[PDB]
Amino acid sequence: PEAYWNREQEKLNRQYNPILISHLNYCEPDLRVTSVVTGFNNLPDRFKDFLLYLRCRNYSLLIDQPDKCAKKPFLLLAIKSLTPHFARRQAIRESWGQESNGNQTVVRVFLLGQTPPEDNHPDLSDMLKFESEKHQDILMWNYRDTFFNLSLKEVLFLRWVSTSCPDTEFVFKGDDDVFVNTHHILNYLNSLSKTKAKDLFIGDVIHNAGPHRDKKLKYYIPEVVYSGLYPPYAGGGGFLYSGHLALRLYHITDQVHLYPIDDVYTGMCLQKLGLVPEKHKGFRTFDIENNICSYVDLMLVHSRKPQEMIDIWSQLQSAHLKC
Ligand SMILES: *[C@@H]1O[C@H](CO)[C@@H](O[C@@H]2O[C@H](CO)[C@@H](O[C@@H]3O[C@H](CO)[C@@H](O)[C@H](O)[C@@H]3O)[C@H](O)[C@H]2NC(C)=O)[C@H](O)[C@H]1NC(C)=O
Ligand SMILES: *[C@@H]1O[C@H](CO)[C@@H](O)[C@H](O)[C@H]1NC(C)=O
Ligand SMILES: [Cl-]
Ligand SMILES: [Cl-]
Known part of the structure; x- marks a missing residue:
C-alpha cells in the first residue's frame, strides 16, 4: 500500500485483531511522516499538520454543559460552528434550534474548537464565555478548529x-x-x-x-x-441518526484512523460496522433558494444565512394554512 492512510489503517487493523493506544494519545509531532511520505515538504500546510498530529485525539473540554442531557432527550441537535459565528448560532437558537420538552425533549449544542491567537484570530474568548453562560449550549475543546x-x-x-x-x-x-x-x-x-x-x-x-x-x-x-474509493457517506451539511448508533459509532472510531474529510470519516466508521447510510431525498444539500411549499416536506436545506433562517422559520409556522 503506497498511500499513507491505507498503510496506517492496515497496520491498525492488525492491532485490533490481537493474537489469542499510541495512535490516540501521542500528541508530540510524528516526525516520521517526513521521510515515509514522499513529497511531504511540498504538500499544503493543512496536510502537513494533519499527518504530523494524526495520532493525537485526547483533547479536553474547555467549555462543557454537563446537565444538557439531565433529562432524556428525544432529539439532540449538534451544530458544528466556529467561534466568530455568533449571529449564525443566535439565529439557530431563535428558529429551528429551539430547545423543547412533554415526551419529545429537544436539546441543542454547538460544537466548537479553538480559534487561537497564534493563528492571528481575534480574541473573542470573553464574548464566547459570556455567550456560554447566557445560552448554555456551547461545547468547546482545546484543539485548533x-x-x-x-x-x-x-x-x-x-x-x-x-x-x-x-x-x-x-x-x-x-x-x-x-x-x-x-x-x-x-x-x-x-x-x-x-x-x-x-x-x-x-x-x-x-x-x-x-x-x-x-x-x-x-x-x-x-x-x-489516500488510495482507493470512498465508502457511501452522507455529505452536504446534516445527517440524522439514532442514539443507539452514536454509541456504536464512537467505539469504532478508535479502530479507524482520522481522515481529512469528516463526512468520509463518518462513512468509513459506518462501513467498519457493516452499516450503510440511507439516502433521503429530504436532505437537499442542493438547493439555492417565493416558495415556502418546498420547506414543509423537506428535512433540511443547505445553505441559509442567519436572516434567511429566521425568515423561513417564521413563514414555516403558518405553512399548514398557506401551503
Ligand atoms: C488539529 O488540532 C491540533 C490541536 O490544536 C493541532 O495540533 C497542534 O498543531 C500545532 C501546529 O499548528 C502544534 O504547534 C507546533 O508545536 C511545535 C512543538 O515543537 C512547535 O515547534 C511549532 O512551532 C508549533 O507551535 C501543536 O503542538 C499541536 N498541538 C497539539 C495539542 O498537538 C493540529 O495541528 C490541528 N490539525 C490541523 C490539520 O489543523
Ligand atoms: C494525550 O495524552 C498524553 C499522555 O497521557 C499527554 O501527554 C498529552 O498531553 C495528551 N494530549 C492532550 C492534547 O492533552
Ligand atoms: Cl480559562
Ligand atoms: Cl455569524
Missing part, C-alpha cells in the same frame, strides 16, 4: 455523547449555515417503526465517490495520502 480537523470535531462529539448524553433517542449533526425543518424531523422520527429506528442513519448519501485529485479543489486528496 480547522477544516482538516473536522474529523476530530466528529470523534470528540461522539465521545461527549458517550459520556454525557448516552440516552438521547436520536441525534442530528449539521453545520451552522443549514436550515432544518425540525417539525418535519420530529414527525419523521415519530413515524419510524422500531426496526428502522434502532440503527437509523439517513442523509444526502453519495455513492461511488472517490478522492478529488485536482490540487485546486477544496476536497483534494493526493494519491500519496
Whole structure:
C-alpha cells in the first residue's frame, strides 16, 4: 500500500485483531511522516499538520454543559460552528434550534474548537464565555478548529455523547449555515417503526465517490495520502441518526484512523460496522433558494444565512394554512 492512510489503517487493523493506544494519545509531532511520505515538504500546510498530529485525539473540554442531557432527550441537535459565528448560532437558537420538552425533549449544542491567537484570530474568548453562560449550549475543546480537523470535531462529539448524553433517542449533526425543518424531523422520527429506528442513519448519501485529485479543489486528496474509493457517506451539511448508533459509532472510531474529510470519516466508521447510510431525498444539500411549499416536506436545506433562517422559520409556522 503506497498511500499513507491505507498503510496506517492496515497496520491498525492488525492491532485490533490481537493474537489469542499510541495512535490516540501521542500528541508530540510524528516526525516520521517526513521521510515515509514522499513529497511531504511540498504538500499544503493543512496536510502537513494533519499527518504530523494524526495520532493525537485526547483533547479536553474547555467549555462543557454537563446537565444538557439531565433529562432524556428525544432529539439532540449538534451544530458544528466556529467561534466568530455568533449571529449564525443566535439565529439557530431563535428558529429551528429551539430547545423543547412533554415526551419529545429537544436539546441543542454547538460544537466548537479553538480559534487561537497564534493563528492571528481575534480574541473573542470573553464574548464566547459570556455567550456560554447566557445560552448554555456551547461545547468547546482545546484543539485548533480547522477544516482538516473536522474529523476530530466528529470523534470528540461522539465521545461527549458517550459520556454525557448516552440516552438521547436520536441525534442530528449539521453545520451552522443549514436550515432544518425540525417539525418535519420530529414527525419523521415519530413515524419510524422500531426496526428502522434502532440503527437509523439517513442523509444526502453519495455513492461511488472517490478522492478529488485536482490540487485546486477544496476536497483534494493526493494519491500519496489516500488510495482507493470512498465508502457511501452522507455529505452536504446534516445527517440524522439514532442514539443507539452514536454509541456504536464512537467505539469504532478508535479502530479507524482520522481522515481529512469528516463526512468520509463518518462513512468509513459506518462501513467498519457493516452499516450503510440511507439516502433521503429530504436532505437537499442542493438547493439555492417565493416558495415556502418546498420547506414543509423537506428535512433540511443547505445553505441559509442567519436572516434567511429566521425568515423561513417564521413563514414555516403558518405553512399548514398557506401551503
Ligand atoms: C488539529 O488540532 C491540533 C490541536 O490544536 C493541532 O495540533 C497542534 O498543531 C500545532 C501546529 O499548528 C502544534 O504547534 C507546533 O508545536 C511545535 C512543538 O515543537 C512547535 O515547534 C511549532 O512551532 C508549533 O507551535 C501543536 O503542538 C499541536 N498541538 C497539539 C495539542 O498537538 C493540529 O495541528 C490541528 N490539525 C490541523 C490539520 O489543523
Ligand atoms: C494525550 O495524552 C498524553 C499522555 O497521557 C499527554 O501527554 C498529552 O498531553 C495528551 N494530549 C492532550 C492534547 O492533552
Ligand atoms: Cl480559562
Ligand atoms: Cl455569524
